[PDB]
Amino acid sequence: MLKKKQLTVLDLHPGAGKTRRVLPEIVREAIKKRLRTVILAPTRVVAAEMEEALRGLPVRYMTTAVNVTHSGTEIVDLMCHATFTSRLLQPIRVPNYNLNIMDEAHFTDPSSIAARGYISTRVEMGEAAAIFMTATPPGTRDAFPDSNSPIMDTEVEVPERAWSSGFDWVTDHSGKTVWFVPSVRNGNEIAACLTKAGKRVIQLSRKTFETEFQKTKNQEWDFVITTDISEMGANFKADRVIDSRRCLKPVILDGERVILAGPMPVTHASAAQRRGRIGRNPNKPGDEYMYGGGCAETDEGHAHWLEARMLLDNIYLQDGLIASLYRPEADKVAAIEGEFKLRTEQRKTFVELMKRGDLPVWLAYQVASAGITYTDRRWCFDGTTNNTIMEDSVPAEVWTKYGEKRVLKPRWMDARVCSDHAALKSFKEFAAGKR
Numbered sequence: 001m002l003k004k005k006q007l008t009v010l011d012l013h014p015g016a017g018k019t020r021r022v023l024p025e026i027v028r029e030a031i032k033k034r035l036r037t038v039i040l041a042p043t044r045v046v047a048a049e050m051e052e053a054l055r056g057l058p059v060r061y062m063t064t065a066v067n068v069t070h071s072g073t074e075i076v077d078l079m080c081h082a083t084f085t086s087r088l089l090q091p092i093r094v095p096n097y098n099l100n101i102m103d104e105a106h107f108t109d110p111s112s113i114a115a116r117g118y119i120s121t122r123v124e125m126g127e128a129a130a131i132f133m134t135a136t137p138p139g140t141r142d143a144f145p146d147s148n149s150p151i152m153d154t155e156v157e158v159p160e161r162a163w164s165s166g167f168d169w170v171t172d173h174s175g176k177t178v179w180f181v182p183s184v185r186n187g188n189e190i191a192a193c194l195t196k197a198g199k200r201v202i203q204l205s206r207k208t209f210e211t212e213f214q215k216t217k218n219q220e221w222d223f224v225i226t227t228d229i230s231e232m233g234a235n236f237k238a239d240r241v242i243d244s245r246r247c248l249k250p251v252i253l254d255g256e257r258v259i260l261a262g263p264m265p266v267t268h269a270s271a272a273q274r275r276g277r278i279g280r281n282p283n284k285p286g287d288e289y290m291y292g293g294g295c296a297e298t299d300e301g302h303a304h305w306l307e308a309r310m311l312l313d314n315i316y317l318q319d320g321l322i323a324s325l326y327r328p329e330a331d332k333v334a335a336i337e338g339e340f341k342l343r344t345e346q347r348k349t350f351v352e353l354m355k356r357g358d359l360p361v362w363l364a365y366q367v368a369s370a371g372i373t374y375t376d377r378r379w380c381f382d383g384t385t386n387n388t389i390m391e392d393s394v395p396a397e398v399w400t401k402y403g404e405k406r407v408l409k410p411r412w413m414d415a416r417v418c419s420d421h422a423a424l425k426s427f428k429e430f431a432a433g434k435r
């Protein structure tokens with residue numbers, strides 16, 4: 001496994017112990033063999049759980065999710081997927097990792113896809129070894145994999161709106177339920193209905209995940225309402241998953257705008273991970289998985305794979321060579337390797353628009369490749385009339401950095417900057433020059 005030129009997919013079923021049992025064995029072996037190693041966690045929550053599994057072992061934690069005093073002698077680095085790719089985009093000396101370990105390696109956010117592409121390319125070049133840990137590798141077709149204890153699988157109509165009758169089984173349940181919704185806004189409406197019905201609800205999404213996930217440990221709850229972020233190794237003490245089996249898909253239309261298409265079916269991988277939240281306790285058989293639709297391979301044509309190519313085109317590898325996407329996910333996007341390579345100053349703008357600007361990759365690329373500098377926000381206001389962003393059914397307005405009240409009307413429209421109240425608030429702050 002640890003030998004150079006080898007990429008290993010550790011595809012044990014969900015809950016089989018990849019993170020708590022196998023990972024520490026690999027790390028002890030890597031240290032014995034003096035292999036410089038990186039461990040990539042999908043989330044800060046997983047990074048902290050890895051610290052518990054790896055406690056005692058000399059690991060440098062490159063995350064403020066862990067409070068450790070390092071020795072400076074560690075040859076094993078641990079960071080989130082996004083941090084790895086983020087540092088690769090910056091003028092930062094990159095250690096030669098002989099061994100590259102990615103946990104929850106099914107994660108489809110652009111920076112995770114890019115990290116797999118960089119790593120697998122280095123393995124293909126004979127420069128390194130890699131281990132990708134996931135029950136659901138790219139292209140998996142089995143939504144119902146093995147579990148630690150038997151699961152009751154039931155195809156059932158699942159509400160996606162508030163309801164007054166017809167779904168008694170949802171609220172008649174006395175255990176804890178994890179409910180996967182297609183979007184934050186959808187989750188808000190279901191959560192309000194459950195709260196009105198007397199349930200205690202916690203809501204999880206990408207921007208709130210680390211903070212809100214702690215509440216699943218610190219307080220009593222009946223329902224966790226979550227987007228697909230909880231597919232990435234989030235552990236709950238639950239006995240039921242309700243799965244809409246739906247997600248939103250960012251889709252680039254006519255190379256000029258990004259829409260959030262759907263809700264549409266999840267992939268088999270996603271469905272298996274959603275289901276995989278339960279059936280984890282061999283002493284508690286009969287956890288329930290209620291699913292409200294079929295699976296489809298909706299990662300095909302999904303903007304994240306094009307965005308991953310934008311990131312990798314702007315990461316140095318060797319001379320003019322450019323890292324390929326990991327082979328099993330390399331034909332998901334029509335994309336020409338190298339087509340998004342930016343010159344020095346535009347590439348720095350691109351990085352800053354993602355890092356400080358917090359803009360989606362695709363949108364950051366449009367701005368940077370247009371030769372616009374980071375602090376120049378005129379593009380947020382000079383788009384066509386159908387790019388007007390709406391707030392409470394009237395055009396959203398901000399005061400520009402010049403002190404002028406203007407309608408938010410970006411030259412490039414990416415629906416992710418206004419998909420919920422929090423997103424729009426952050427984009428308004430950006431348009432105003434506030435970061």
Ligand SMILES: C[C@H](O)CNC(=O)Nc1ccccc1
Nearest residue numbers: 060061062063064065079083
């Ligand atoms: C997101 C991360 O917190 C940012 N970077 C780090 O923490 N970097 C780091 C920490 C310890 C040793 C060497 C490097």
Ligand SMILES: C[C@H](O)CNC(=O)Nc1ccccc1
Nearest residue numbers: 077084087088092093094095
């Ligand atoms: C003190 C340690 O060597 C810090 N480790 C790293 O800086 N790791 C790193 C740097 C660039 C890209 C990806 C990963």
